[PDB]
RNA sequence: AGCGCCGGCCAACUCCGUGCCAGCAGCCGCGGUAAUACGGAGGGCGCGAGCGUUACCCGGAUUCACUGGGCGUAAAGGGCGUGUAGGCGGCCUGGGGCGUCCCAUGUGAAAGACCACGGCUCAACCGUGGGGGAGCGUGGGAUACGCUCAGGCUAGACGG
RNA sequence: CUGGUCCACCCGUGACGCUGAGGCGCGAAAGCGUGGGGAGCAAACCGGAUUAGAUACCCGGGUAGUCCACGCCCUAAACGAUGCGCGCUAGGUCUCUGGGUCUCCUGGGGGCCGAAGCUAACGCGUUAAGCGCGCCGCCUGGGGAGUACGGCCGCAAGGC
């Protein structure tokens, strides 16, 4: 279900603001900038969907995890299509060290949704309107994902693992398998199924993350692709 | 010499019964019966969290009281014992049993080791046919520990034989009754004597 | 340079402290034989004579535990602890009697004898001692 | 189930205007004498929430000790901070001969037969932690092989 | 049957008397009118023909650190060179065998210590038997390491 | 007139090396001796203020000295409060100075941030306070005290 068109795609980049931990999954460097070794890529992606197969034919999920603006609606769409938790906005720390708490925010959001049925004494002082729909779209801006998860994901997935350094820090303190795309300035040992290549384009991000579901929606049954890419 | 007070307010002391006046041991009148608290004014006061040197100094306290016999001797006891190659816990224990004084009670010569003194240091008792009047005596296997035929006929040896007539003593023993006369079969184990006693506290009091 | 057997040890010991595959220590005949007993002993995947610009070297090829899980992934280390015991500003020997046991069993102690390098069980196996060179865990 | 043991349990202060406010901490050690243990150190306004707290981290940090016959496979020192323990196995009626702190570990771990030695800062808190992370390294033929 | 002790370390708590006094104290500290810390008492703890105190030795003191410590700010880098003695010293080969290692052998008195048995009713005490050690003398052996002597090398160092 | 040091070539010598108790030399300022010099500054000193007072801080004066030669003195927060040499253990960035094939790379310096590791922490981190070897110096509770006595040095002050 793989591919080689990761080449016309990204190959990486980001100079020398690198971490030499990401060294042995180089080629050269070009034009001043880091090149990644795409057949490493190639290895590792087998080897990193090998597991996520195994983890999709089993019922477990897998919280996404992408805030950079680049990769924060190509993670909405693609997390979406499998129908597994996501996290575009702001991360919040204790999302898995402290999950019973974070997860009585969503009960507040449940809640909040099942008050908006009206009337349920929606009769109200108006202030008092305006003031829980505003902490609705609040709670909806950051849980709009984490509600699907109701306990303690199997795996994450990390676009720039440097970016989210603490969800990596949460993930690996509950023994929680990171899988990950990351380049230079990454450092590759903090994940434990690497994807090793560009994370600043949405040409890179798209393309992995919609192959990463390809596998998920394929080994829960029904292989259907043709998915959202903005050009 | 020994200790020669009141011996309830031991048992109170310990929490724990040490059965140390014979037959009155196992009345209704026992003191542990009824008050099992410590002696004196703040007996019934609620305790305070002992310290593990209080927890280990009851342990050693209990042992010894137990045999009535001076922490002199109580702790050359242990002091051969802890040379001795092998496990300390054992050996000391079984050195402690295989006083003479302590045998005589184990043979039901006697209600308590107290009254066992008072018979060996009178010569009421022998071992091997040599009359011995010393409690201390280390009593070795093969041995024979028969009541001085010279005072076989005495009112307090007799009803107390009467008493262990088909009674078993321990393993490590046999008792001739009828004969008055009984055998050191093999220094004993902590498994032949549940004392009411962790022993291995004894060891860690004394390496303080 | 004054000990070029501790500053081997002291090679290997920061390689492996940072998972390096290999390092290179200037080549001699005495340090061949004590990486020939980290070899067979399993402390090392082995070593070959190779040659840095012109120059006879040993290239050491170290071995560690399986990645671990949780926060700290480093592996565990094969040689956990190795250090000169003979130094040139003191030297070290004992006779057979006296030889030790490193770890209670799980250590090596190399020594040289005169029937060379051996292990402490190798020279308490042939009744010799000799120079305590080093301990390996 | 699991025992317990407080191993120590302190007051500590904080100054401001008014005066003094209190604090308490709790080392607890929980462990079944039979090679798990786990070291928690619980603080919390009151000793009793402190303490069971303790408890929690307690079990949320457990360690395998290699027993073998109630001592420990190898001798093992480590130092913890400023602070130094020291284990070496014993024979059978040895005992466990160690100040209460590494005490109240090895036993509740299940070690019947021990030598020990507590060097540089005496610290409660340091010994114990250096304790476990030397329990924590004890290793057995089986690991020394499977390793080489 | 006596002696010490009962604030914490450290095992054992109450009443009175005193009121920064009289006094206690190994250290930290107690005592200024409700003192488990002074004095007595009752009670308790610990030992027992002993119990305490004083002095001194080793231990706790890895606090002179060989085992087994340190020196940016805690006590601790010489104000800086230069260099004498000394300590230490790279790669390969061979000779010697000084250190070093092994084997044999002599010495290592008796008592004591240690394991066993035995004798004084036990023990203390004492008797009998057993096991060695280092260290040094001698003989034989080994040669990796250090040493020494000889030869070679260029990675250190030094010159062009 | 003269020292140290770096680079490139890889040409010469063949371990000729490291450290270094003593010794020897150097050693800011102030101070000393003989003799010069003396504008500015400025201990001591005189005066004005300030102030409760003001043997100070501020102001107006002012002699040593500050400067030169020669000879002494030998101290210091003489500091990176960090002895010297060597080997080893991620990088990022700024800069001085060489050599390149001049982007860049590679030597030698000077900084900053940081890998692993270290540290009581602060912090250190290829310019180590990391990991090792060699050698030197030094510490061992505060005060008494860098004092006293002895010795050695100095013209003295005073130094070791
Ligand atoms: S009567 Fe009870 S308390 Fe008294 S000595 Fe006998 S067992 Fe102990
Ligand atoms: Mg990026
Ligand atoms: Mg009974
Ligand atoms: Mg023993
Ligand atoms: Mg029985
Ligand atoms: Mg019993
Ligand atoms: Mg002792
Ligand atoms: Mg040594
Ligand atoms: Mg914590
Ligand atoms: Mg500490
Ligand atoms: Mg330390
Ligand atoms: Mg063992
Ligand atoms: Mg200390
Ligand atoms: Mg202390
Ligand atoms: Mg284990
Ligand atoms: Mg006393
Ligand atoms: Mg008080
Ligand atoms: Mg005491
Ligand atoms: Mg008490
Ligand atoms: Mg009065
Ligand atoms: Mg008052
Ligand atoms: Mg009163
Ligand atoms: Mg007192
Ligand atoms: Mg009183
Ligand atoms: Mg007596
Ligand atoms: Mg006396
Ligand atoms: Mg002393
Ligand atoms: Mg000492
Ligand atoms: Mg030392
Ligand atoms: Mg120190
Ligand atoms: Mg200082
Ligand atoms: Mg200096
Ligand atoms: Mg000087
Ligand atoms: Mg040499
Ligand atoms: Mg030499
Ligand atoms: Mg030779
Ligand atoms: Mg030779
Ligand atoms: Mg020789
Ligand atoms: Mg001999
Ligand atoms: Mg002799
Ligand atoms: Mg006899
Ligand atoms: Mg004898
Ligand atoms: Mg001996
Ligand atoms: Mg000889
Ligand atoms: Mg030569
Ligand atoms: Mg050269
Ligand atoms: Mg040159
Ligand atoms: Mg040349
Ligand atoms: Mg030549
Ligand atoms: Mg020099
Ligand atoms: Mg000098
Ligand atoms: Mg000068
Ligand atoms: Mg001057
Ligand atoms: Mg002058
Ligand atoms: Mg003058
Ligand atoms: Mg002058
Ligand atoms: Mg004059
Ligand atoms: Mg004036
Ligand atoms: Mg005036
Ligand atoms: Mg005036
Ligand atoms: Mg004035
Ligand atoms: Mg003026
Ligand atoms: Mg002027
Ligand atoms: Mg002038
Ligand atoms: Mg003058
Ligand atoms: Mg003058
Ligand atoms: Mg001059
Ligand atoms: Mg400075
Ligand atoms: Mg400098
Ligand atoms: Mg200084
Ligand atoms: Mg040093
Ligand atoms: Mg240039
Ligand atoms: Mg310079
Ligand atoms: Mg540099
Ligand atoms: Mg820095
Ligand atoms: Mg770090
Ligand atoms: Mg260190
Ligand atoms: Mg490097
Ligand atoms: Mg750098
Ligand atoms: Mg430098
Ligand atoms: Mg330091
Ligand atoms: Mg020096
Ligand atoms: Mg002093
Ligand atoms: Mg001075
Ligand atoms: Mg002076
Ligand atoms: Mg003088
Ligand atoms: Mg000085």
Same mark, same amino acid.
């Given at each position: 279900?793989?591919?080689?068109?990761?080449?016309?795609?990204?190959?990486?980049? *980001?100079?020398?603001?690198?971490?030499?931990? =990401?060294?042995?999954?180089?080629?050269?460097?070009?034009?001043?900038?880091?090149?990644?070794?795409?057949? %490493?890529?190639?290895?590792?992606? *087998?080897?990193?969907?090998?597991?996520?197969?195994?983890?999709?034919?089993?019922?477990?999920?897998?919280?996404?995890?992408?805030?950079?603006?680049?990769?924060?609606?190509?993670?909405?769409?693609?997390?979406?299509?499998?129908?597994?938790?996501?996290?575009?906005?702001?991360?919040?720390?204790?999302?898995?060290?402290?999950?019973?708490?974070?997860?009585?925010?969503?009960?507040?959001?449940?809640?909040?949704?099942?008050?908006?049925?009206?009337?349920?004494? @929606? @009769?109200?002082?108006?202030?008092?309107?305006?003031?829980?729909?505003?902490?609705?779209?609040?709670?909806?801006?950051?849980?709009?994902?984490?509600?699907?998860?109701?306990?303690?994901?199997?795996?994450?997935?990390?676009?720039?693992?440097?970016?989210?350094?603490?969800?990596?820090?949460?993930?690996?303190?509950?023994?929680?398998?990171?899988?990950?795309?990351?380049?230079?300035?990454?450092?590759?040992?903090?994940?434990?199924?690497?994807?090793?290549? #560009?994370?600043? &384009?949405?040409?890179?991000?798209?393309?992995?993350?919609?192959?990463?579901?390809?596998?998920?929606?394929?080994?829960?049954?029904?292989?259907?692709?043709?998915?959202?890419?903005?050009? | 010499?020994?200790?020669?007070?009141?011996?309830?307010?031991?048992?109170?002391?310990?929490?724990?019964?040490?059965?140390?006046?014979?037959?009155?041991?196992?009345?209704?009148?026992?003191?542990?019966?009824?008050?099992?608290?410590?002696?004196?004014?703040?007996?019934?006061?609620?305790?305070?969290?002992?310290?593990? $040197? &209080?927890?280990? /100094?009851?342990? %050693?306290?209990? /042992? +010894?009281?137990?045999?009535?016999?001076? @922490?002199?001797?109580?702790?050359?006891?242990?002091?051969?014992?802890?040379?001795?190659?092998?496990?300390?816990?054992?050996?000391?224990?079984?050195?402690?049993?295989?006083?003479?004084?302590?045998?005589?009670?184990?043979?039901?010569?006697?209600?308590?080791?107290?009254?066992?003194?008072?018979?060996?240091?009178?010569?009421?008792?022998?071992? #091997?046919?040599?009359?011995?009047?010393?409690?201390?005596?280390?009593?070795?296997?093969?041995?024979?520990?028969?009541?001085?035929?010279?005072?076989?006929?005495?009112?307090?040896?007799?009803?107390?034989?009467?008493?262990?007539?088909?009674?078993?003593?321990?393993?490590?023993?046999?008792?001739?009754?009828?004969?008055?006369?009984? %055998?050191?079969?093999?220094?004993?184990?902590?498994?032949?004597?549940?004392?009411?006693? #962790?022993?291995?506290?004894?060891?860690?009091?004394?390496?303080? | 340079?004054?000990?070029?057997?501790?500053?081997?040890?002291?090679?290997?010991?920061?390689?492996?402290?940072?998972?390096?595959?290999?390092?290179? !220590?200037?080549?001699?005949?005495?340090?061949?034989?004590?990486?020939?007993?980290?070899?067979?002993?399993?402390?090392?995947?082995?070593? *070959?004579?190779?040659?840095?610009?012109?120059?006879?070297?040993?290239?050491?090829?170290?071995?560690?535990?399986?990645?671990?899980?949780?926060?700290?992934?480093?592996?565990?280390?094969?040689?956990?602890?190795?250090? +000169?015991?003979?130094?040139?500003?003191?030297?070290?020997?004992?006779?057979?009697?006296?030889?030790?046991?490193?770890?209670?069993?799980?250590?090596?102690?190399?020594?040289?004898?005169?029937?060379?390098?051996?292990?402490?069980?190798?020279?308490?196996?042939?009744?010799?001692?000799?120079?305590?060179?080093?301990? !390996?865990? | 189930? =699991?025992?317990?043991?407080?191993?120590?349990?302190?007051?500590?202060?904080?100054?401001?205007?008014?005066?003094?406010?209190?604090?308490?901490?709790?080392?607890?050690?929980?462990?079944?004498?039979?090679?798990?243990?786990?070291?928690?150190?619980?603080?919390?306004? *009151?000793?009793?929430? &402190?303490?069971?707290?303790?408890?929690?981290?307690?079990?949320?940090?457990?360690?395998?000790?290699?027993?073998?016959?109630?001592?420990?496979?190898?001798?093992?020192?480590?130092?913890?901070?400023?602070?130094?323990?020291?284990?070496?196995?014993?024979?059978?009626?040895?005992?466990?001969?160690?100040?209460?702190?590494?005490?109240?570990?090895?036993?509740?771990?299940?070690?019947?037969?021990?030598?020990?030695?507590?060097?540089?800062?005496?610290?409660?808190?340091?010994?114990? $932690?250096?304790?476990?992370?030397?329990?924590?390294?004890?290793?057995?033929?089986?690991?020394?092989?499977?390793?080489?």
């Amino acid at each position: 279900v793989k591919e080689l068109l990761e080449a016309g795609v990204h190959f990486g980049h *980001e100079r020398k603001r690198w971490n030499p931990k =990401f060294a042995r999954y180089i080629y050269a460097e070009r034009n001043g900038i880091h090149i990644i070794d795409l057949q %490493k890529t190639m290895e590792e992606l *087998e080897r990193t969907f090998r597991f996520i197969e195994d983890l999709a034919m089993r019922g477990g999920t897998i919280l996404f995890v992408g805030t950079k603006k680049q990769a924060q609606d190509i993670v909405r769409m693609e997390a979406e299509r499998a129908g597994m938790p996501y996290v575009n906005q702001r991360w919040l720390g204790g999302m898995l060290t402290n999950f019973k708490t974070i997860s009585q925010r969503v009960h507040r959001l449940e809640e909040l949704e099942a008050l908006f049925a009206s009337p349920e004494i @929606e @009769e109200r002082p108006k202030k008092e309107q305006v003031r829980l729909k505003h902490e609705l779209e609040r709670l909806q801006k950051y849980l709009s994902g984490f509600r699907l998860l109701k306990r303690l994901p199997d795996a994450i997935f990390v676009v720039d693992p440097t970016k989210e350094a603490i969800a990596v820090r949460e993930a690996r303190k509950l023994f929680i398998p990171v899988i990950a795309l990351a380049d230079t300035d990454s450092d590759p040992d903090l994940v434990d199924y690497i994807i090793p290549g #560009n994370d600043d &384009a949405i040409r890179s991000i798209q393309l992995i993350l919609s192959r990463a579901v390809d596998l998920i929606i394929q080994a829960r049954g029904g292989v259907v692709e043709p998915s959202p890419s903005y050009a | 010499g020994r200790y020669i007070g009141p011996v309830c307010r031991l048992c109170r002391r310990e929490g724990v019964k040490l059965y140390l006046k014979g037959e009155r041991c196992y009345s209704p009148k026992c003191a542990m019966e009824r008050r099992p608290y410590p002696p004196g004014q703040h007996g019934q006061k609620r305790a305070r969290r002992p310290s593990d $040197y &209080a927890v280990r /100094l009851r342990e %050693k306290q209990k /042992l +010894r009281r137990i045999y009535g016999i001076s @922490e002199r001797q109580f702790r050359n006891l242990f002091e051969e014992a802890s040379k001795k190659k092998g496990v300390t816990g054992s050996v000391f224990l079984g050195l402690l049993e295989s006083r003479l004084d302590n045998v005589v009670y184990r043979l039901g010569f006697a209600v308590s080791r107290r009254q066992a003194r008072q018979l060996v240091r009178h010569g009421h008792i022998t071992v #091997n046919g040599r009359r011995v009047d010393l409690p201390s005596y280390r009593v070795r296997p093969g041995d024979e520990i028969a009541v001085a035929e010279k005072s076989r006929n005495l009112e307090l040896i007799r009803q107390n034989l009467e008493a262990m007539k088909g009674r078993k003593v321990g393993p490590w023993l046999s008792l001739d009754v009828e004969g008055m006369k009984g %055998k050191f079969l093999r220094l004993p184990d902590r498994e032949d004597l549940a004392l009411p006693v #962790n022993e291995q506290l004894v060891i860690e009091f004394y390496s303080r | 340079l004054t000990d070029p057997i501790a500053d081997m040890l002291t090679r290997i010991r920061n390689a492996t402290r940072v998972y390096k595959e290999s390092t290179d !220590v200037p080549a001699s005949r005495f340090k061949e034989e004590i990486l020939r007993i980290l070899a067979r002993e399993g402390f090392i995947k082995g070593y *070959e004579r190779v040659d840095v610009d012109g120059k006879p070297y040993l290239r050491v090829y170290l071995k560690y535990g399986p990645r671990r899980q949780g926060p700290d992934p480093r592996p565990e280390q094969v040689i956990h602890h190795i250090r +000169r015991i003979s130094k040139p500003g003191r030297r070290v020997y004992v006779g057979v009697k006296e030889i030790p046991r490193v770890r209670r069993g799980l250590g090596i102690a190399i020594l040289s004898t005169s029937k060379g390098v051996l292990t402490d069980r190798e020279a308490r196996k042939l009744g010799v001692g000799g120079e305590l060179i080093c301990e !390996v865990w | 189930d =699991f025992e317990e043991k407080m191993i120590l349990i302190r007051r500590t202060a904080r100054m401001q205007a008014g005066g003094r406010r209190f604090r308490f901490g709790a080392l607890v050690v929980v462990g079944d004498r039979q090679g798990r243990v786990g070291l928690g150190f619980g603080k919390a306004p *009151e000793v009793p929430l &402190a303490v069971q707290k303790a408890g929690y981290y307690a079990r949320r940090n457990m360690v395998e000790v290699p027993l073998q016959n109630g001592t420990i496979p190898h001798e093992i020192e480590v130092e913890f901070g400023a602070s130094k323990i020291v284990l070496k196995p014993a024979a059978p009626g040895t005992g466990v001969i160690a100040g209460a702190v590494p005490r109240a570990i090895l036993e509740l771990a299940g070690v019947t037969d021990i030598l020990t030695k507590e060097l540089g800062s005496r610290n409660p808190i340091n010994i114990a $932690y250096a304790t476990m992370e030397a329990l924590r390294q004890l290793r057995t033929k089986a690991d020394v092989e499977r390793l080489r």
